[PDB]
């Protein structure tokens, strides 16, 4: 099989400045017929693979002159002229040229905006998940940048540990933010016999770090 | 105006089969030749199987050769993978695609355990529980199985200020997200809110209002 | 995020009072002049009427002066208009907008006739009728006043391939319009396709699953 | 006020070649702080007017380079180096030096794409609008170009008129084309003593003109 080799896998970017990703194929691109069959694929979030350049250099069908490709052989480059919000995602280069088809690890885009800092909502269970026997409690922080964030759950002031899971989104190809759930899940039993239920929020664009909080039965 | 439609996904029992189909429209499908490309979350493109044009020449990786099938109906315009023997690292999600153009994909998961459906719960806004100058508010999307599951706001006509987040395996071995939607601060009682809920492999659909509750 | 988001819109009698709300919201609201902008079908941006910053200087067209009033709240980051004495030519979507961002607009219809609920029906699609290489169906949303309708597919899950036509008045007064979708013909049994249609001015939702009738 | 008016206000350009929009004042635009405050919005199809180029030249948040904003006074003009189709929609020349806010005519710029024949098909009544005592029956042209085609109607070979309306969708953003829908109404009544309901279809991008068409039950 025909290796492909990219150069980075991460890619910061401030947007408007430029970009660059190398391809390196562990054998010769250039098939019978003198044309060479290297690809580039973009995935945005959410998305299935989109064909951006098809054979080294060409355009595809939708696609804007800030992507350009080069090279030849086994040596290529992808350019971003002017990276938008919009271009986030994770670059695939690919050959076609011989069988099997084989892709890169992948280049994952990341757009250098400015600081902004999370807003931050925590949600109580609900009454009626509170009949099934647990109860979910949810702190969403939203709309940040950059993504390093910090999340602790404190009941009655206890930090918690063990019993939390995080999700993050990709970064938002509109305004190049992410946003976070942080889901503390414990017994009812458990959730009744305390009072106090916080979510506490450390990240780089807050001068001091956030708690919203609760009181459980009070609104 | 090209699509590429699959279908066939689901949940198997480890050795058991699973048979996967892609509808083409838009293009000479007799004249391309046609790939099935998998990808676990996270983790990047894995070809599955290959075949030509007429199509009478396939490739498959040892991975998978011996296993999988790849056949292929220039009449109906389809294409098909048949899976057998199916393992546990075969979990992903399976795109159909012709070089130009992908499907949305359909998702396989192979496990020793049961479908189950979601429970949807309110995530109930409130004030002064407002964060300059919007309010939040949402759906907790718990103890599913397998993937995936559909979430919208409003059938469909909310979709600014929408988050939804990556599906999380809890320790039980289920699914769960939340689904979030953060409006204007003063425009909360000029609208109701309703998240859409859909998960096919248990036919699961729940349409749950969310309210500010007293 | 900066978001806009008008309400208040719908029906009056000539003659009659409407009050429009806008709710700002990721941008500092009180540093900026708003105004309402609004736009009948096909027509372009006609300038309705302007405040200023503190909301201590406002502007009217003589076509709505003496009439309409916008009013302004920097404390709830919200924007008013008074409309008052309505004429059957302000039939219009109506744009809350600060320079930057507009928007997604209300719609304000001025008629002596009453609301009435659309009809929905089944555009049934065939195999062998298939229009290579796809198949085509939809729904008929029928005999509503007065706009807006919204309609999705699969509770949005469903977009690419989609159609909604633009809204046409028959000769009875009333609305009425189509929404399609095109699959690849083989895609046709593999998966089922409801058309979600509200029109909140009637309260009306209906979901209709479409199917090939055999 | 200050008039605003733009040239041209029809833009048919073929993908990837530039084009050029003007406007012009009734008067200048530079304001008493030297600056000028004139800008240029986008309402796609389906949507709200977004903002472009703001005070001449400022290429507004996430807008491509493609799109360059020039001028002074009372001349101003907004170039597209290279017409993408998402770029479909009207384009508004905008004052805001003095009050009132005003703007443009709009200019619509239309992709002059390859041709595209439509896919057409034709959909007979349902039996529950039936009950109703009404009868629409519905012909889809879809995803053709350019826009202009003709649709006729034929009941028992009959060519009809004046019982139909159409209705055309914007240009669409991704494949620069258009889809058309023709409703032939009719009561119960007139719809149950005929049999052959057609659909009729001209379009440059045919050869000769397409015919759907059932007959009322099968």
């Known amino acids: 099989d025909i290796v492909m080799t990219q150069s980075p896998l991460s890619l910061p970017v401030t947007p408007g400045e430029p970009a660059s990703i190398s391809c390196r194929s562990s054998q010769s691109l250039v098939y019978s017929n003198g044309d060479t069959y290297l690809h580039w694929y973009l995935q945005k979030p959410g998305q299935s693979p989109q064909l951006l350049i098809y054979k080294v250099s060409n355009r595809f069908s939708g696609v804007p002159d800030r992507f350009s490709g080069s090279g030849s052989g086994t040596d290529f480059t992808l350019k971003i002229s002017r990276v938008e919000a919009e271009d986030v995602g994770v670059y695939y280069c690919s050959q076609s040229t011989h069988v099997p088809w084989t892709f890169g690890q992948g280049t994952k885009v990341e757009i250098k905006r400015t600081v902004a800092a999370p807003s931050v909502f925590i949600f109580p269970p609900s009454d009626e998940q509170l009949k099934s026997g647990t109860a979910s409690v949810v702190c969403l922080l939203n709309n940040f940048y950059p993504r390093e964030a910090k999340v602790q759950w404190k009941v009655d002031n206890a930090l918690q540990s063990g019993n939390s899971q995080e999700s993050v989104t990709e970064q938002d190809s509109k305004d190049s933010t992410y946003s976070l759930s942080s889901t503390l899940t414990l017994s009812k039993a458990d959730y009744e016999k305390h009072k106090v239920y916080a979510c506490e929020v450390t990240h780089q664009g807050l001068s001091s770090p956030v708690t919203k909080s609760f009181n459980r039965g009070e609104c | 105006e090209v699509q590429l439609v699959e279908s066939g996904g689901g949940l198997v029992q480890p050795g058991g089969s699973l048979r996967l189909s892609c509808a083409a429209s838009?293009?000479?499908?007799?004249?391309?030749?046609m790939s099935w490309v998998r990808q676990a979350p996270g983790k990047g493109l894995e070809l599955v199987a290959s075949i030509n044009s007429n199509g009478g020449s396939t490739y498959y990786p040892d991975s998978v050769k011996g296993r999988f099938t790849i056949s292929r109906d220039n009449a109906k315009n389809s294409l098909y993978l048949q899976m057998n023997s199916l393992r546990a690292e075969d979990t992903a999600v399976y795109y159909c695609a012709s070089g130009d153009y992908w499907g949305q994909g359909t998702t396989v998961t192979v496990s020793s355990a049961s479908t189950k459906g979601p429970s949807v719960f309110p995530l109930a806004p409130s004030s002064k529980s407002t964060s300059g100058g919007t309010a939040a508010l949402g759906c907790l999307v718990k103890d599913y199985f397998p993937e995936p599951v559909t979430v919208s706001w409003n059938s469909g006509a909310l979709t600014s200020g929408v988050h939804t987040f990556p599906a999380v395996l809890q320790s039980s071995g289920l699914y769960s997200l939340s689904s979030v939607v953060t409006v204007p601060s003063s425009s909360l009682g000029t609208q109701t809110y309703i998240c859409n809920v859909n998960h096919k492999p248990s036919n699961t659909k729940v349409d749950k209002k969310v309210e500010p509750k007293s | 995020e900066v978001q806009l988001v008008e309400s208040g819109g719908g029906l009056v009698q000539p003659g009659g009072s409407l009050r429009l709300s806008c709710?700002?919201?990721?941008?500092?609201?009180?540093?900026?002049?708003?105004?309402?902008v609004r736009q009948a079908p096909g027509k372009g941006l006609e300038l309705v009427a302007s405040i200023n910053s503190n909301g201590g200087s406002t502007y009217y067209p003589d076509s709505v002066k003496g009439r309409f009033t916008i009013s302004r709240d920097n404390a709830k980051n919200s924007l008013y208009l008074q409309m008052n004495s309505l004429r059957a030519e302000d039939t219009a979507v109506y744009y809350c907008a600060s320079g930057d961002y507009w928007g997604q607009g209300t719609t304000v219809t001025v008629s002596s006739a009453s609301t009435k609920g659309p009809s929905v029906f089944p555009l049934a699609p065939s195999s062998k009728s298939t229009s290579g290489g796809t198949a085509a169906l939809g729904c008929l949303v029928k005999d509503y006043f007065p706009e807006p309708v919204t309609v999705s597919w699969n509770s949005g899950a469903l977009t690419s391939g989609v159609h909604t036509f633009p809204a046409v008045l028959q000769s009875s007064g009333l609305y009425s319009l189509s929404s399609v979708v095109t699959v690849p013909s083989s895609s046709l049994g593999t998966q089922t396709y409801i058309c979600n249609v509200n029109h909140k001015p009637s309260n009306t939702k209906v979901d209709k699953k479409v199917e090939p009738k055999s | 006020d200050i008039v605003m008016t733009q040239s041209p206000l029809s833009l048919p350009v073929t993908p990837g070649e530039p084009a050029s929009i003007s406007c012009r004042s009734s008067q200048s635009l530079v304001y008493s702080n030297g600056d000028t405050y004139l800008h240029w919005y986008l309402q796609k199809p389906g949507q709200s007017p977004q903002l472009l180029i703001y005070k001449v030249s400022n290429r507004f948040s996430g807008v491509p380079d493609r799109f360059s904003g020039s001028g002074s006074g009372t001349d101003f003009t907004l170039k597209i180096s290279r017409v993408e189709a998402e770029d479909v929609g009207v384009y508004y020349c905008s004052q805001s030096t003095h009050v009132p806010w005003t703007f443009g005519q709009g200019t619509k710029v239309e992709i002059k794409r390859t041709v595209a024949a439509p896919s057409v098909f034709i959909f007979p009544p349902s039996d529950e609008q039936l009950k109703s005592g009404t009868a629409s029956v519905v012909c889809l042209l879809n995803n053709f170009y350019p826009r202009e085609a003709k649709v006729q109607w034929k009941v028992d070979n009959a060519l009809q008129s004046g019982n139909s309306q159409e209705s055309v969708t914007e240009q669409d953003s991704k494949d620069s084309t258009y889809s058309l829908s023709s409703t032939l109404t009719l009561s119960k009544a007139d719809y149950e003593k005929h049999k052959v309901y057609a659909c009729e279809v001209t379009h440059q991008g045919l050869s000769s003109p397409v015919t759907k068409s059932f007959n009322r039950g099968e």
């Open positions: 838009g293009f000479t499908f007799s004249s391309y030749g």
